[PDB]
Each structure stands twice: as structure tokens, then as C-alpha cells.
Amino acid sequence: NSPHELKNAAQRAADWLVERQRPNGALPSRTAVIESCYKGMWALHTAGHTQAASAVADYVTSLLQPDGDIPQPREERYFLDVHYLYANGYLTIGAHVLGRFGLSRKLMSFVETMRNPATGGFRSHGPAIPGDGRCDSVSTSISGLAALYTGRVDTARSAADFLGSLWVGQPDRKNVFHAVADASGAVLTSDDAVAVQVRKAEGDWYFIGLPAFFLTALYEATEDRAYLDLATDLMTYMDEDCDEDAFVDSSCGKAGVAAALLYRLTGRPRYREIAEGIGTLLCERQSPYGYWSEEETGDVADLFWGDLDMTAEYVLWLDLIGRNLASGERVWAGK
Amino acid sequence: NSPHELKNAAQRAADWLVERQRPNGALPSRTAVIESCYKGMWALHTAGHTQAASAVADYVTSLLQPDGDIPQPREERYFLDVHYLYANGYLTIGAHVLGRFGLSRKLMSFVETMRNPATGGFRSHGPAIPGDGRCDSVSTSISGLAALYTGRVDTARSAADFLGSLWVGQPDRKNVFHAVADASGAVLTSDDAVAVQVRKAEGDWYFIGLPAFFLTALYEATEDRAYLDLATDLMTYMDEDCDEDAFVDSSCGKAGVAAALLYRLTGRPRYREIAEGIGTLLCERQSPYGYWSEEETGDVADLFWGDLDMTAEYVLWLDLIGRNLASGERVWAG
């Protein structure tokens, strides 16, 4: 599959979302929750649907609290005490690229209140959510990326320090990737902490792919070779040590974008194969109507919140893979 | 007409630009200069043509100097010693929204070196270009917008300080808007400086509209009332004191975006009138072939650099006006 066809698949899903966008700007979710449209602003903006993206911004602004958070509506536990800031991250990036500087500043300011200044990580649970102050690789990676987009590179650099200490302190990485560390920085190995079975096809690969993507973007922002080495170390960790599911499961989109980005930066052919093989897989899973779903195949007017979030998510990654694959070809053709 | 038609008109020109893009990412310009595609990254990104916008980013990157500037290829006088940073400003914004953080950081860093720390304005003439250290409203506004997009809010605020001092220091604003200040920060009334004939229909209105756009965006970022009042003061200054050409001239696009953004922020219907009239007028002037041009009317495969920049510019403003008019209705029409 070529970058042109990856983009065509993203444009079809974007057209599907815009055609069924609610009058208040919310995306057609069967449950009114923030976890169903938190990627909506960024995804629809890269697809050219700026009026639909601005509509999501109006819906998101109506949910904003004076402290800069959107604690409600939230139902999924993973957006409560696993990676609470996962929604806030995309909301910050989407608002900032749209020019909603007031929305992005307020969102990014609350995200900074959840940063652990000792470790550089971000708290896994939101305010008034019971927790122990643990920090995970997903909340930290998406917060560092939001800091990159909002121009707060010290926050992003601090986020990479948490990812570097988390990768170094893995107790046995060949079997389990522990993506959580406690408030003091010790890698959390308890049963209630998120752990990726790297030798099993059980998903949760975005706990490793998102760090690889953020660190690759931070390297491009800074050209600090430590961020590139850690990004390539995680890409090698997923390509050779991890299960084949790491590049097949629905959560493999972050690893595909990191591979496409790394291809444009380094020019290595293997990173092109990873991005091409992932973008091809996502194009085949797409329903004929445009959306993506685990079980739905009908000409529906709405989707389960997870299917809608995945639909907007694949608009982003397919666009991001395609523009980096195409740019990487022009840059490294004969050079 | 409607926010949709404004968006459809922008998509037509964006498809036209992508249709004739050169393999190196450069836009179809008759002369290969940076002033023919500096708006390309931002305009094509907002139109969904991310692969073509990224191709422009590859072309711009190959022209990037170690200091973060693109001094060549340049030829037009206005991009040399009138507002040299006009190209650099759109390059920084377009690179940052695309995620080219290394390209945006290097461009924003050179722009900061062009800042006058004593006044907040940005030097009008680039390095090795003869000049007297003057700073204009266009260079200061677009550099402040780039600082806004790159998160350097202190630089953006310092740009608004220069614009406020330039507005207060006007010795005769009823007939002329001196858009240039000297190195010391005083309004420059020299005959060779940029001065808009305000009571006359003689263009150059973007020396006022772009400050109004930047200040409105800085108000949204900070909600500091001083940035709003100065933006409405410039909007009122353009609406009543200035000639009708302030909203009819080809350089009225920046004022149209400022009006649409002010309409979403304040809800006052006159701002929707100004933006809807400019957006409608821009669709009227669009050549049914897709591009914009002052004279050309054929099925050409390339454009004069001034028309190619106008084509990318109107893709940006029509999209910005359309999505700020549509969002303002949802917020205020209830």
C-alpha cells in the first residue's frame, strides 16, 4: 500500500465521522463520554475537516472546568486510574494545532499539575480518583508530546527522563514490560500495575509504541542522540523481542507512526517495512463505509465509544505514516 | 456565502496546488523563490493535503541555513527590506503544525534574533540587507503569531507591546497609519517607511489587519483585556475611519480572519458581517480554474509567484474564516 492509499483510507473515515457529527460538535458515539472523541480535534484537522474539528473544540470547551481538566463525562476505567491524561493529551494537541490557544493553554496547564517533578512522569489517576501516585508510560508519553506541540520542551525532556529510567529499570523485559512506576520512581511490578506480556498476543502494545513515537518526535525537536537511541531501542525491542502481535494488534498504530517518522529521520529501510506493513494492515480492517470496528459491519449511524475512538485514531496514524513514508522517499532517494 | 462554500473554495485551490507540485516539494512557481511558497506548509496542512504540505517541508528544509534562516532564493523587495520575516513567520507556523519540531525550532530561533529587545518589534530588513534597524507591524505581527504557535508567549506579548505603542504613538491616524517604527521605538514618519493612505483606497491594509488578527489570537491565548481592546480598536479603526478598500483590497484577508475570530470570541454580529463579506468576495474573485490571479485566466500549469502565494494565502484565510464563522454560530446563535 502506497502513501496515497493510506491517505485515502484516512479521508474516508474522516468523511464518515463528519457526516454523522452531532450539532453540538460531539462525534457520533453511543455514549456521551470524552473518551469517544478526545482524538477528534487532531484527527479531523489533519484530514482537512477544520470546521468539524472546530466543532469538536466547541463541544470540548463546553466540558472544560476552571482548573483546565475535563473529569466528566468519563466511564472507561482506563481513562480514570490507568492513563487518565490520555484524553487530555490529544485534547491539548488537537486544540493547539487548531489555534485554540486558550483551550490548549488551560488543558496543558492542568496536565502539568499531574507531573511528578521527582521522576518526570505523570500521575495515572485523575483528581479525586483513588490512587497511590503511580505514573505510567502512556500518560507520560502523551503529556510529553503535548508539551512538544505547545512548546514546553522542558516538560517533554522531563517526560523522556521518566521513560529512560522506566526502560533501564525493567526487571525482566524479555517476558514482561512493566509500564508503571511509583511516585518515587521505582518500577512497579505489582499485579494491579499495567504489564505487557511481550511474548503473548494480548495487545496493550501502545504502552511501548507511544513512548517510541514521542521519543522520536523529541529527537527531531532537539537532535539529542539519547532520545534517538532510546526510540530505536524500543523499536528493536518490539521488532525482535516482542510478539508478532506488537505489529498486528489494533494498538500497533503508534509503533507504525514511530517507524514512519524514524524512516524519514534515519533513512533505514527496516523502519519503512514496519510502517508499510502496519499501514497496509489498518487499511484492510477498514469497513467499506469508512469506520473501524471490532465487531460492527453494518451501515450504522453511530458506534461504540471504543470503535469511534479507534476510527479517529486511525485517521491520525494513517495520515502520519503516509506523509512520513512519502517524505522519507523523497529525502533518501539515491541519497 | 456559507462556511461550507468558503471551505469548498479553499479545497479547490488546494487541489489545484497539489495537482502541479514539483517532485522536490516546491509549488508550481514560475520563478523558484521562497516568497512563492512560504504559506504552503500551513495552507496545505489545513486543507488536509498533509503529504503535499510535508513535501513543501522537505523543500523548505533543503533551503535551511545553519542559523535557521532561508536568505535565498529571494528577489522581491518586500521580502528583503520591507518585511523580511514575513516568509519566516509562515514557515515557522506551517512547520510547527505539521510536527516538524526541529524545523520549527530552528526557524523560530532565527526570528527571535531579529527581535528588537528594547521595543518588541522585529527588524524589517534581513541580515546583510541595507537598513536602519526599523521594525514594521507586519514582521512583528507574523513573528508574534509564530511565537504564539510555538509556545513562546513572552515573545508574543512583547510583539503586542510594540503594536500597542505603535498604535498610541500615531501622530495622525485619521489620514495615515505609519506602520514602521525606528530602532528606538518611536513611530517612523520617514517618506521611505510604510505609511497606509487610510482615507484613500490604496491597499496595504494588511499592515493593520494582520496586527488585528495576531492580537485577537493573543487575547484568546491569554484573555488579557488589553489585547482584546486593541484588536477591536483596530477593527473599529478599519471599519469606520479607514476607506472601504480596507475590506475590498486583496490584502483584506487578514482582517477577514480577525473579524471571524472576533465574532466567535465576542459574538457581536458586525464581526460576522465583515468576515462573511470578505469571504464571499474572495470566492467571487477565485478563478473557476481553482487558483487566484490578478490577470491570469487560463488553464495554466504554473503561476506567477505573487499569484501562487495569493492562492495559498486564500486557502488559509477562507478556511480560518469558515471554521470561525461556523463555530461562532454554534456558540452564540443559542
Side-chain angles (χ1 to χ4, degrees), chain B:
Chain B
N1 284 301
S2 71
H4 256 273
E5 167 61 273
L6 317 167
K7 181 57 172 164
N8 310 122
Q11 293 313 115
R12 234 134 48 218
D15 290 322
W16 188 95
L17 281 172
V18 168
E19 222 186 311
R20 357 199 104 67
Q21 216 192 5
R22 313 185 185 290
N24 65 338
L27 294 197
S29 181
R30 284 166 194 180
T31 64
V33 281
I34 197 65
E35 52 258 38
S36 76
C37 63
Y38 60 100
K39 303 207 186 85
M41 286 187 284
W42 192 9
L44 298 163
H45 186 127
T46 60
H49 288 287
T50 57
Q51 289 183 19
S54 199
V56 181
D58 307 307
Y59 179 65
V60 165
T61 298
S62 82
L63 296 169
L64 182 72
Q65 277 300 94
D67 66 340
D69 184 22
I70 301 197
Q72 290 292 332
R74 287 192 193 224
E75 253 166 20
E76 167 63 25
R77 151 109 183 304
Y78 270 67
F79 296 96
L80 290 168
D81 55 284
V82 181
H83 48 51
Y84 180 91
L85 290 168
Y86 202 49
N88 308 69
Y90 291 89
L91 292 167
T92 310
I93 294 156
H96 194 82
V97 299
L98 261 170
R100 300 275 180 121
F101 292 128
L103 177 59
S104 80
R105 165 177 82 62
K106 282 157 197 177
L107 292 158
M108 209 36 233
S109 291
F110 168 79
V111 166
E112 272 262 23
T113 73
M114 282 297 260
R115 183 184 87 104
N116 190 295
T119 72
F122 287 68
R123 205 176 90 179
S124 280
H125 59 109
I129 313 285
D132 58 356
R134 68 186 56 192
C135 309
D136 60 285
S137 65
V138 154
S139 298
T140 309
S141 296
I142 196 63
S143 294
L145 198 71
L148 221 42
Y149 268 97
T150 56
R152 319 189 171 187
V153 71
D154 273 316
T155 306
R157 283 182 181 272
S158 188
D161 290 333
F162 173 88
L163 296 176
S165 177
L166 196 87
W167 173 247
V168 166
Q170 286 299 317
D172 187 60
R173 73 176 51 84
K174 306 301 279 149
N175 301 276
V176 51
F177 184 78
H178 289 284
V180 188
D182 55 52
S184 74
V187 181
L188 180 66
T189 49
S190 71
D191 308 343
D192 61 352
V194 188
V196 201
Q197 297 308 302
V198 152
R199 278 258 278 284
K200 191 39 209 313
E202 267 163 342
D204 286 321
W205 305 102
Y206 73 112
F207 284 84
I208 304 169
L210 185 60
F213 175 31
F214 158 64
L215 285 149
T216 309
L218 185 48
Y219 172 67
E220 169 169 17
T222 62
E223 263 156 75
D224 283 8
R225 270 313 281 231
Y227 303 145
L228 175 65
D229 298 342
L230 179 55
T232 80
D233 280 354
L234 288 178
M235 200 46 68
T236 303
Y237 176 60
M238 267 179 110
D239 193 21
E240 307 163 359
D241 303 6
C242 292
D243 194 79
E244 314 134 305
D245 195 54
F247 304 147
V248 200
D249 182 54
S250 56
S251 74
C252 77
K254 277 136 266 67
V257 176
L261 184 48
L262 276 170
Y263 163 71
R264 171 164 75 80
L265 266 39
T266 62
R268 309 178 212 145
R270 178 58 184 150
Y271 296 139
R272 208 241 308 140
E273 277 187 275
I274 306 174
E276 218 148 24
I278 282 147
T280 286
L281 163 153
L282 287 174
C283 301
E284 297 274 14
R285 295 168 171 175
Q286 180 169 30
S287 141
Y289 303 100
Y291 51 82
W292 274 270
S293 177
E294 291 233 41
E295 314 301 334
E296 191 76 289
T297 39
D299 201 345
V300 300
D302 45 66
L303 271 167
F304 166 69
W305 78 263
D307 298 326
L308 202 76
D309 185 40
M310 185 168 45
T311 296
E313 173 167 339
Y314 288 168
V315 161
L316 262 175
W317 299 161
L318 280 186
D319 174 275
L320 282 184
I321 291 152
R323 85 206 206 191
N324 276 296
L325 284 197
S327 271
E329 194 172 287
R330 180 181 294 101
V331 175
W332 293 103

